[PDB]
Amino acid sequence: CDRIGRCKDIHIYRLVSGNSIEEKLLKNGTKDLIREVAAQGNDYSMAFLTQRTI
């Protein structure tokens, strides 16, 4: 997306639903990588549940 808009003052707009977990995932999206341990029963991210609730 940045490559195609390589120059000429490109404008990027992002739509995110307010008061939803989408904002939490946007601000913090590294959880997918932090849990790169063996799949099929990771069972990690205990404290990160606060984002799903809010």
Binding site: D2, C7, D9, I10, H11, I12, Y13, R14, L15, V16, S17, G18, N19, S20, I21, E22, L25, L26, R35, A39, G41, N42, D43, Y44, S45, M46, L49, R52, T53
Partner: protein, 124 residues
Amino acid sequence: QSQQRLLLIDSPLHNTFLELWTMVHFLVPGISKVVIRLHRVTQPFILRRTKRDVEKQLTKKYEHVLKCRLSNRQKALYEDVILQPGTQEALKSGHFVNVLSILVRLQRICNHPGLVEPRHPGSS
């Protein structure tokens, strides 16, 4: 047969001096604290720069995050999803990663009720 030569490289390796020496030799055929001395030796023939030049160098990028509330249908679907047996799954009851990913996907497609709830005509 050429009187001059020009080479383009993205970035060379720090260690493995063999490659650097071979490149310097093939530049011109007239040659037979560690990193500091290596850079000092490569002073006469070197021209490198970093991306710090992009500052005010016509590189103008703009990003605007626009917040948008949910519709009544979206609110209803969200309340329904969060208020379901999945609550226990969200509380890490079993297969935590799987149920979390499933709930995230559901809430993601819930950004438009027409996707999960396809409005259809009321035929008679």
